[PDB]
Each structure stands twice: as C-alpha cells, then as structure tokens.
Subunit: 238 residues, 2 copies
DNA sequence: GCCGGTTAACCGGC
DNA sequence: GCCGGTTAACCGGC
C-alpha cells in the first residue's frame, strides 16, 4: 500500500476534523502523495490526453495494456468513444475506486467508507461479490497478480466530528471469511475495523481461494432460496 | 381507490421529489382521509392513551395484515409519546375510510434519463403480505396503488398493483429482490377475486425463486467452477 | 451476538 | 428492444 506508510498521520490529522470526510482524505493524499494521488475519472482523463491521436473505444481500451486493469477502470464503450478534451469524464459513483494511487504501474484501489458510530452497527456494502469474482477470474486468465491492491480506509464520526479511523486491505483478509449478502446486490459486507488481515498465501492463491468461496456460497444460496422463498409458500399454491 | 375519482384533478395548469405537491393536493380535497403513515400512527395511539404495552398498541390495529404492513416495531412503538417520517414506511401516503385502506406510493421519474425500471416493492415482502392476507381472509382490507410523476412535470400516471397480472411482475432478485417497473408500464387487466390475486402472486414468486436458484448456478457457479 | 432484508434510483452490453 | 447488476449505507427480531 502506498498510503499505509503514512496512515498514522492520516489518522491523527482526521481525528477531530469537523458524511463525506472522503474529500478531506483525498485533499490530504493530494498534499503528501501528490504524484500518486488520482481520482479514478481524473486518471482516465489524463491517460486519454497523453494520446490525443488515439480515438475510438476499442483503441482507447488498448491504452490500459492490461485486461484486468481495463475491467476495473474503463468506462462504457459509448462513453469512452464520446470522450473528448471537450467532453471529459466526471465523478460517477459506479467507479470502482474512490481514490486511485499509482506508481511504477502498480495500483492501489482505495475506497473510503464512513460510519456514524451513533447508529447501530450495520455492515455496509463494500463491493459486489460477483464483480470481485469476475475480477479474480481476470487476474488468472491473464496472470496479473502484481498489479493492484484493493484497500479501504474508514472514518468514524458522530454528531459531524471524526472520532476514529481504520485501514485494511482486502487481499490480506481470509477469502473464506468474506460475508456475501446475496439480497444486498450480492455485496460483501464488513466494517474495515473488523476485517481479518492474516492471509499467508500468494495473491494468486487468494484469487483461487476466493472463487472457491464465491462458488460455494452461490451453491448454498441457490438451495437456501428454495428453503426461504419456496417451501414456506407451498401451502397457498392449490 | 379514493384517489382514482379525483385522479383527473391531480393536473391542470401548473403555473427532486414533486411528492409534496401530491400530498398537499390530496389533503385539500380529501382532508378527512389523507394522512402520512407516521402521522396516522400518531393518531391510532393518540386516540388510546390507556394503552402502553407494545403488545397492546399492536393488537389495536385489529388486523394482523395491517399490523404487518404498518407497525413500527416494538422498540419504536414502545418509545412513543413522536414518530418521525421514516422512508422505511410501506407507503408515502395513506387513505382510510370505513375500515378500508389505500396504500399509495408516490414515484417521481427523471424523464430525461434513460428508462431504467426502479425498485417498487420487495417481492419477498409482497409474498409475506399475500400470505397474511390469505391466512386471514382479509381480501377486502387494503389496496396498494401508485402515482408516478415525470419531470425534466411533463406527465403523470396511476396504477393499482392488485389490478395487474402477477406473472408479469419482474422480480429483480439482485436488486434486493425488488419488483421493478415504471408505473406507466404496469399491466392493468387482471380479472379475478383479490384472494385470486394473492394466490396467483405466490405461484409467480415461488416459480421465480426457483428460476433464480437455477440462474445462480449457471451465472455465478458454472463459469467459475474451472478455477 | 448473530444475522440479512431495504432505500431510490441508476446504465451498458449486445 | 431486452435484461439485470450497482450505490452508500442503514436496523430490528430473538
């Protein structure tokens, strides 16, 4: 992680600051890691400007030089082709990372989550378990196991004042422990502070291991659906 | 529908929720009928000070289906004395007359945007609902209708859920198992008893649940199996 | 503690 | 046209 070596300072500077503290975190990185800090859409824009001679989606989809990167970063075909110095990319919540850290072609997909301590703890949607599945399949089909890391920074607040923060990395957690809430848009849910960080194997093992977990949960869920949405309603079908 | 008769009036000459307007108009012409859910709850209790146990304030609903669709839950009802408007309510607007309830949902649509069916109601919840209905013979207790408002107010629409063909309700399982549709596209030619509707809905739900179970093996299992 | 259903909408592939 | 996955979080039952 590019930001871990300076996570302590972020924690310090944030604790006390008076829902989107995301902006304050971004502002920070921009001042301490100016050469590495990009918003995802900024990155795409900058990448397209360096090559004004390359137009059309299929062509601009080549500029990534990585099928996993293309998958995690690229916008829709129409949007890519309609991109121009005149018609640039803007925010877009559906963008994978909230903050992109790049260096030596290594990418840290950082997301910033915020929780309202006052409220009763409720694990938020962290990411699509399917999207993660596909992502893991790309890493293997293409053998890209040393390209990006998916990390999270959490900022706890109350009535708004930041009271504390947390920092964890997805690829350092036990893939078999990730909770997949199928009803909630098949999204993994957890609190950064509660994320397990003891994975010992390689990034490829993780990828494989996650798939086993995803596939296994999808099997179980298919069955539990008959359990919860079929059996208890047989009564009335006569 | 207590609103249907005046649905012609909910639009004349005018001069991002336009839901306020929808509520104020109903309050004006159907004052002694129109109320918000949180506001209505305040009444049921404010008309009964003697009751305080959360298991008592519950039986006041004098209906197991209504209780299911309208109650706020133990802790919430127990700590009553306010009841804020919680988007978690079943309906945005409620209208009762002679022991009958019209549960109205007000949807607004950004017309300029690309047509994307929005979440209407949880298919699962609607299943439990039909269950309570049938096992309670309460097929003449309430209606679940919808009023949609387009804008860029370009136009509006109004439909009744218990008036559409069940088999046509698209249950988008990934999107929190919610039925999706724009009011203006909802089917409106169902012919049968209300009890017929509920039963028909359950068949559709169960069948779709099985179809989803199957879909999961082919889209989330089959293609990742190899690894 | 443990557990998982619900908001209001919103694209992009083919 | 036709189809369905994604946001950022949020809460009550036993």
């Amino acid at each position: 992680s590019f930001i871990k070596p300076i996570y302590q300072d972020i924690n310090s500077i944030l604790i006390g600051q008076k829902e989107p503290f995301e902006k304050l975190v971004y502002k920070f990185l921009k001042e301490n890691l100016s050469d590495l800090t990009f918003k995802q859409y900024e990155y795409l824009n900058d990448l397209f400007m360096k090559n004004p001679a390359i137009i059309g989606h299929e062509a601009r989809y080549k500029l990534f030089n990585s099928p996993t990167l293309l998958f995690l970063l690229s916008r829709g075909k129409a949007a890519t082709e309609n991109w121009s110095i005149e018609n640039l990319f803007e925010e877009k919540q559906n963008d994978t990372a909230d903050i992109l850290l790049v260096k030596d072609q290594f990418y840290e997909l950082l997301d910033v989550k915020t929780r309202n301590i006052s409220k009763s703890a409720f694990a938020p949607n962290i990411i699509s378990a399917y999207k993660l599945a596909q992502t893991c399949a790309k890493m293997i089909d293409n053998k890209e196991f040393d390209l990006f890391d998916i990390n999270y920074l959490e900022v706890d607040w109350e009535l708004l004042v930041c009271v504390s923060t947390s920092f964890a990395e997805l690829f350092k957690s036990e893939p078999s422990e990730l909770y997949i809430n199928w009803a909630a848009a098949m999204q993994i849910q957890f609190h950064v502070r509660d994320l397990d960080q003891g994975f010992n194997g390689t990034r490829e093992e993780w990828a494989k291991s996650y798939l086993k977990h995803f596939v296994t949960q999808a099997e179980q869920r298919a069955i539990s659906m008959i359990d919860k949405f079929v059996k208890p309603f047989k009564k009335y079908i006569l």
